[PDB]
Ligand SMILES: CN(O)C(=O)CC[C@H](C[C@H](N)C(=O)O)C(=O)O
């Protein structure tokens with residue numbers, strides 16, 4: 001049949017996708033800005049399609065409920081045919097790869113530790129061996145699921161600590177995790193993806209830092225429904241943009257070029 | 264039909280695949296050791312196949328001749344049906360992705376600079392702005408092709424320099440590049456993948472170092488013929504091994520655990 005506008009699902013998460021300050025004076029895709037908005041434009045230009053940016057209804061990335069077997073988040077929107085492509089900081093994981101297609105990664109990351117400056121922690125092992133400095137994750141997403149599933153001794157110990165710690169060490173949003181680090185006088189550390197950690201380190205009031213090595217190594221990928229014809233072209237576009245240096249240019253644009261914490 | 268032994272193509276390159284010192288007393292897959300030998304065993308165990316390690320006949324990774332349009336190297340062995348899978352430090356590139364299937368990356372790398380300790384170079388830009396310290400690449404492979412194709416100003420300038428430099432700055436093997444760095448009294452820098460650079464930095468006589476940031480960011484993938492049914496299982500195996508921490512364990516084993524240059 002005739003070409004149709006491609007429905008893109010994404011999520012509001014700075015600096016990936018944000019509503020522009022003047023969004024009420026704008027329409028359609030022009031309401032949004034950020035790394036993933038720019039990436040979507042480049043992918044569409046290379047693949048030759050028109051598209052519509054939509055925001056995932058349930059605000060989730062993608063997991064399958066053990067009881068109902070239903071996929072939520074952006075993964076669910078692809079699985080159930082509500083969107084054609086997801087362009088977002090969506091981690092490539094085994095269980096997601098079983099149900100949707102992913103491009104090769106467009107950005108690398110690992111789980112990492114965010115501390116308030118001056119907190120005496122240098123590694124995951126350091127955290128795991130103590131309780132005075134509380135630590136936790138989001139209550140949803142691949143970072144939480146990493147800990148919940150891990151059989152690596154240090155990480156399994158961290159998960160057991162997080163489940164049993166009081167008061168709750170879990171947060172609902174990135175903003176809440178960052179605020180908790182900033183307001184807890186060195187007594188809370190937040191486990192999050194290194195990409196986000198690096199972004200926040202360059203935001204005022206410049207009081208956080210990423211410490212130690214990353215806990216794992218993985219990537220974000222562009223996702224499509226399993227078997228979608230769109231997958232091949234989008235993957236080739238990611239590879240081309242990477243080779244051209246354009247993915248690095250976009251990370252620099254949104255993370256560092258207008259960093260607020262000096263040069 | 265009945266299951267058949269899977270033909271794996273790979274290449275002799277330390278520390279990925281090496282003939283064991285006592286190889287003449289051994290047979291079959293047991294003749295070989297290294298990171299990729301261990302990785303092959305893990306992939307086969309997860310996917311449930313038997314396999315035979317074979318060494319690529321022409322000693323190349325994979326490129327298409329502009330005149331004959333024939334693919335060489337491990338990519339060629341897959342394209343022409345001489346092997347079922349390639350398990351090697353084979354860089355995922357756009358032009359290769361067009362003709363074979365790749366897993367998600369099992370190892371990250373970027374092009375990097377190897378110097379003899381004490382050489383006054385800290386970046387690609389530094390190299391590009393001078394000629395007293397000669398610099399070059401292998402005469403075959405993705406690093407060479409990166410420079411040949413780049414439209415990034417610094418890298419295009421480096422390529423023009425390399426093509427016109429005398430005596431020739433190209434080398435035929437990794438061993439020749441490393442020897443040239445070691446023997447040139449600080450007057451040769453070798454451009455190579457960061458993985459290899461990091462390996463050599465931990466080998467006696469401990470006189471090289473990796474300097475500056477990487478020039479690009481990419482990955483090695485397990486390759487199969489386009490459309491091969493084996494691709495799905497192998498990709499899921501890579502993702503599982505990564506999540507379990509086993510890829511990092513294997514890199515540590517072959518790069519650092521028996522490093523020769525201290526702790
Ligand atoms: C960058 N961004 O995505 C965030 O920080 C949000 C929380 C991520 C989601 C994760 N990428 C997923 O795909 O599940 C996490 O689980 O850490």
Ligand SMILES: CN(O)C(=O)CC[C@H](C[C@H](N)C(=O)O)C(=O)O
Pocket residue numbers: 276324325352353354355401403404405406407437455456458459
């Ligand atoms: C690790 N190993 O692979 C080497 O050092 C050999 C040379 C690599 C080959 C490259 N991975 C390819 O896939 O073409 C290079 O072009 O730098």
Ligand SMILES: [Li+]
Pocket residue numbers: 096097098099100101102
């Ligand atoms: Li998939």
Ligand SMILES: [Li+]
Pocket residue numbers: 359360361362363364365
């Ligand atoms: Li491919």
